[PDB]
Design a protein around this ligand. Sequence first.
Ligand SMILES: [K+]
Ligand SMILES: [Mg+2]
Ligand SMILES: [Mg+2]
Ligand SMILES: [Mg+2]
Ligand SMILES: [Mg+2]
Ligand SMILES: [Mg+2]
Ligand SMILES: [Mg+2]
Ligand SMILES: [Mg+2]
Ligand SMILES: [Mg+2]
Ligand SMILES: [Mg+2]
Ligand SMILES: [Mg+2]
Ligand SMILES: [Mg+2]
Ligand SMILES: [Mg+2]
Ligand SMILES: [Mg+2]
Ligand SMILES: [Mg+2]
Ligand SMILES: [Mg+2]
Ligand SMILES: [Mg+2]
Ligand SMILES: [Mg+2]
Ligand SMILES: [Mg+2]
Ligand SMILES: [Mg+2]
Ligand SMILES: [Mg+2]
Ligand SMILES: [Mg+2]
Ligand SMILES: [Mg+2]
Ligand code: NA
Ligand code: NA
Lengths: 116, 53, 52, 75, 52, 122, 89
Amino acid sequence: CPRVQYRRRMHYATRGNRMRLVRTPGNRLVMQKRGKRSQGPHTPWVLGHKRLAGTKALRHTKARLAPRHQKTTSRPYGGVLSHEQVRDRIVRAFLIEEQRIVKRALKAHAKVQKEK
Amino acid sequence: RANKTEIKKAIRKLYQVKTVKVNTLIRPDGLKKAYIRLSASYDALDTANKMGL
Amino acid sequence: LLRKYREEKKIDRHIYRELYMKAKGNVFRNKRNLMEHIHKVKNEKKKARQLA
Amino acid sequence: PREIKNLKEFLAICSRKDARCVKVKHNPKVTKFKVRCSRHLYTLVMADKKKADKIERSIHPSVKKITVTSRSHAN
Amino acid sequence: GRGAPLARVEFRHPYKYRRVKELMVAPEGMFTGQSMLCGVKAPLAIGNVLPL
Amino acid sequence: VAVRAKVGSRGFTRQRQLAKGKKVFKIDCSIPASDGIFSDDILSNFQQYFQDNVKLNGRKGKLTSKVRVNMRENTLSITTTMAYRKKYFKYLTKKFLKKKDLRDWIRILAKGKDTYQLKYFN
Amino acid sequence: AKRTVKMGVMGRYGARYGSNPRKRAKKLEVSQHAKHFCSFCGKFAFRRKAVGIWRCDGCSKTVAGGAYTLSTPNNTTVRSTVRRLRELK
RNA sequence: GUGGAAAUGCGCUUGCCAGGUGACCCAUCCAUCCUCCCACGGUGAGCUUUCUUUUCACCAUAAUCCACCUUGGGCCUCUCGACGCGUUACUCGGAGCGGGGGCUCAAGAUUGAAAAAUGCAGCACUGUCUGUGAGUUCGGCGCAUUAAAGCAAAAACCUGGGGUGU
RNA sequence: CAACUGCAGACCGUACUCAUCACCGCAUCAGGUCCCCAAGCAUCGAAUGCUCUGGUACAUAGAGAAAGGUACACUCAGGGAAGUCGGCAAAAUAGAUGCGUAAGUUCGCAAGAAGCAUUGGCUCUGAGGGCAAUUGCCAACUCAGAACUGCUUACGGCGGGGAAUCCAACUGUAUAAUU
RNA sequence: AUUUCGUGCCAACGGCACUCGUACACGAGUUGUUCGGUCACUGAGCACAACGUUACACCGUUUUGUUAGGAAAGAAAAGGGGCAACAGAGAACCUGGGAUGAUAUUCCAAAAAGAAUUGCAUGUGGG
RNA sequence: CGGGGAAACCCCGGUGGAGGCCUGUAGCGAUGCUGACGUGCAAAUCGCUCGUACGAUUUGGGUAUCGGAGCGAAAGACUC
Ligand SMILES: [K+]
Ligand SMILES: [Mg+2]
Ligand SMILES: [Mg+2]
Ligand SMILES: [Mg+2]
Ligand SMILES: [Mg+2]
Ligand SMILES: [Mg+2]
Ligand SMILES: [Mg+2]
Ligand SMILES: [Mg+2]
Ligand SMILES: [Mg+2]
Ligand SMILES: [Mg+2]
Ligand SMILES: [Mg+2]
Ligand SMILES: [Mg+2]
Ligand SMILES: [Mg+2]
Ligand SMILES: [Mg+2]
Ligand SMILES: [Mg+2]
Ligand SMILES: [Mg+2]
Ligand SMILES: [Mg+2]
Ligand SMILES: [Mg+2]
Ligand SMILES: [Mg+2]
Ligand SMILES: [Mg+2]
Ligand SMILES: [Mg+2]
Ligand SMILES: [Mg+2]
Ligand SMILES: [Mg+2]
Ligand code: NA
Ligand code: NA
C-alpha cells in the first residue's frame, strides 16, 4: 500500500545516494539516507592490497574525531605495515649489513696477506 | 541588501528590545520580509501598541 | 548428515572423505539412500576387524 | 541522553549548578529522575519506591522540580 | 591502446632526499622485485640498460 | 502441512483446552433491565439461545458439561476449560439481537478482561 | 570428449565464423586460459590478466610474458645467448 | 607513556620524506531494512430468508548514545599433516592442512537511556501482538564470464620513518 | 592538552506545474519529452484479464433498424485458389507432458524438423525435511499413481508446415517525409 | 513564472454549455548553523598573462608535469593567474504537533513537544 | 563419481552456466495491408501485423569539429 518519495533534493539513484525505508512512531514510511562506507586502512598496493588489523574503517569526519589508537597498533610501522612485513625489514636490515662487514674484512685481509 | 546580523542590531537601536531569532525571505515582488522573535522578557504586543499598530 | 555423523564419531575421517566425494558425484538419491549405505559399509568394517 | 548509575553520581550532577529543572516520572514499579543540564539529559532510575520519596524531599530547594503528567491539546 | 606491458621502476634521487618513479617498456621475463642496473659499469643481464 | 488433510475430517475440529482452566466470560444486561426494553421472557430464551447455539469441537447442541451457561443477576456467565475467543460470544450476541429485531436499539461494548455489556445509543 | 567431439572451447560460437579460423583461434585460446608452471615457487599457478601480464596465485608475483603464453620460444633462445656472452667476460 | 610469549590491548608537538582513505559500481548464491501472505490473540465495524467459533480494518517506535550471543573473513599459539578440509559452483595445504585455545575486522542480534510524557481506535476511561513462509542488490564471496576491452583524477583527511620535548 | 561551561552561528534558492490542459509543436493539438516509489488473484509472468487504496465520470449532446461507408466486430449450405500480375486479405497452427524425429553439414547444427498420444471434477495413496529427548512436535508445495464421475471440445494468452532455384557468408548499418 | 490561496464576478474567452474555471477583479502566501548551491575538488575541455605572427588582433600556442630567451616565490621550496559537474568527489538533524486558507527535516519557548550533532572565540576546574 | 584398457587413451551419469545464441515484455525501429486519414488529431499521424531486444545496445547532462565548410558502417544522408 505505501509508496515513498525522496526527502532531500537529489532524485537519482547513484552509489552516493542510497536510502533505507523506516517506519516512524507516527505510523509512516519515510526514506532515510544511509551514508557511504570506507574500506579502511590497507597495506601498500605494491605489496598486496591487504586490510590491516586493529584499525577501524572510518569516514573523513569520524576519523578526525576518533581516538588515535583506533587507527593504529603500538608497534613500529603501526598503521602502515603488517607484522609479516615488519619482520621482513628487520631481518633484511641485520643480515645484509652482516655480509658487508664480513666481505670488507675478507678484502682487507687478503690484500695484507698478498703484500706479505 | 541587509543581512540577518544587521537587522538584529537595527531593531534594538530603534525599539529597545532584545531578540532571539531572525528569519528572512525575499518576496516574489522583490521586497525582503523578516520575522523577528523577541525575548521572553519583552512583550511583542506591548511593543506593537507603542509603535501604533 | 555426513557432518553430524563425523561429530558423533559413528563415522571416521576415512569413510567421511569417500562418501563426501560420492555425494558430489550423484550417487545417493536422498537421505534414506545415504543412511542405508553407511550401515552397509559399517557392517563390513566390523567383519574385517573381527577377522583381524 | 546519559544514564546515572549510583546515588553519589546523581548528587554531583544535581549540584552542577547547570541544571535548569528536574523532571520526576512516576512509572509503574519504577521512578525516574531526569536532570536537564546543557547538552545532555541525565536520568536516574530507581526500582525501590521508598527512599525515592526521600530523595524527592531532600532535593535542593533552589532547583526547580516538576511532576510529569499526561498534557492534553488544550492543556 | 598499447600491446606491450609497461613496468614501474623506483630509483633514489641522486642529489635529494626523495624517491623517483619511472615508467618503461618491459622486456620479457621482467618480474616484480627484480633489480635494474643502469649505467656504464652495469653487467650484461636481461633488463639492464647499457651503452651500446 | 506435516500431515496432508482429508475431506472426511472436515466436519469436526479440535477445540483445544487450557492448562489452568476455569476461564469465565460475562455478558451484562443491566442497562436494558433498568428500563422496559428487555423482558424476563426474553432473558429466559436468551439463556436457551446461548445454550443450544454454542458449538463444541465443531458440533452444536451437544455440551459435555465442560461449558456452563447458567446466568444469575442479569449476567450471563460462560465458564469453561476449553479454548475460546472472546469475540465469539459478541458474534453470537449480534446474531440473537438481529433475530429479535433489536439491532438498531442495542449495542455491545467491552470493559476489560472477559466482560461485555449492552447499552443504548443516541 | 563427452559433450563435444572436436569443437572444445570454441563450441560457444555456434555455426559461425568458419572451421579453419576457429581451429587457429582454439590453440591460442586454450593456452591463454591454462595454468603455467611458476619457477619462483614451484607451482602450476600462473594465469593471464590482460595481454602479456601473468600473475601467480601462490606467491603473488607478476611477470611480463607473451600475449597467449607465459614464455615464447624466442625468449628462451635469447636468455641462453646473453648468459654465454656474460660468461665470456 | 604503558600491558601481553604472540596475534595485539589501554591511556606533548611536526621543516622533510613514505604509505593509506577518497577510489572505481558483476551473472549466480546467501542476505539486512522493507512489503506480502499465513497461525494465535485483543479492539471496532459488516452480513444474518438460511448458513458462517466467520468477512474487513488496526495492533506503531525517529536520530543519537551506553554495556556486551550469530554469520563471514584475516591472523597468533600449542599439537606439527600425504592424506585431509571445504563450496550450488570452476579450490586449497611443510612457502604450514586439520583439531584445542585465543587476537582482530565487517554485518547483524540482545539489555538499557531517549520513550510513553508520543501515536492510533472506541466511549472520564479502556485496548495498544509474537512466531513461521515467499519476495526484494544494503552488505558478502576483494566473486565466475568476453577481453588484441583489463583501477578516472584531485582537494580534504588518517597513520607512520626521522627529529624535537619530558 | 583532554572535559565542562557562556556566547555567536553569514549569503542565495524554497509558492505551483512537470503534462490526453501549466513545456515544444501558430492552440487546453490522439505527436514528442530524463529520474525515484509500485498492492491482491489467475499465470512461467512488469504478458494479458479482473479488483482494495489513491484518482476520475472531462472530452457537444438527444431521437433513432434508408442507401453507401469505417471498424483495434462476427457467422455462413455444397465445392475448395476455379479468383488475382501474384493465396493480397482472411482462415489456419498454438500451452504443457511422454514418445519420436530426415536429407545436408564447417560436426556446432539443421530441430519446436516432420509426427503420435494425454489433459476436466471429485475422493484417496506414495516419495521428496527440521528440532528436541525409538518417541513427540512442526513447515514447503512439487512430482508420480488409483477408483468414481462428466463433456455442448467451451475465458485470456500462445509457432502453420514441407520440397527446391537465385543473391548476400553470418549479428549489424542505411535514403527523418514514396526505395 | 504567480498558473498557488481566499473572497467576489459572468461582458469577452475554455470551437456545445456553465451558476464552473489555469478566465476576469481585489487582496494574500515561499521563514534553514545541519536541505541544494557558493564558500572549498579535479575531468572531457576553455583561453587572461607572456611570447610570436599579421597592412590590421577580432589570430596561434597555452596538461605527454603544466606558461613565457624565461630574473613571474614577498626559510627551503623548479615549472604565472583563473574557470568548467545543482546525477562524478564533498556534505554536522531526527521524530511529534490542535503549527496554515495557502510554507515546512525551514514554524513550536521555559516542562522550548522535544532529543541531538558539529564550526569559532572565551571562562572555570584538572594545571 | 562410476566403467573399459598392457599402454596410448576411450565411454556413461551428474554439476556448471558460455554465446555480436533462440522465443518473448519495457525500450529502440518501421515490413505489409499499396488499411484509416488525405481542407487530417497530425505541414508524416492513427490501427492491426511486423524487426531486434547482453550488445558494433538504449538514454540524461557536459564538451569538441561548420558553409568555396563540417560530419558520414556512403543514401549526393544530415548540419533548427
Ligand atoms: K527444414
Ligand atoms: Mg533562506
Ligand atoms: Mg603418504
Ligand atoms: Mg607421512
Ligand atoms: Mg588453529
Ligand atoms: Mg512526474
Ligand atoms: Mg498532447
Ligand atoms: Mg498457481
Ligand atoms: Mg500483470
Ligand atoms: Mg501491462
Ligand atoms: Mg462456405
Ligand atoms: Mg482467370
Ligand atoms: Mg498474409
Ligand atoms: Mg541424420
Ligand atoms: Mg512438436
Ligand atoms: Mg546480409
Ligand atoms: Mg523514405
Ligand atoms: Mg463555448
Ligand atoms: Mg553529488
Ligand atoms: Mg548542504
Ligand atoms: Mg531474437
Ligand atoms: Mg494507403
Ligand atoms: Mg546517385
Ligand atoms: Na541480434
Ligand atoms: Na584539463
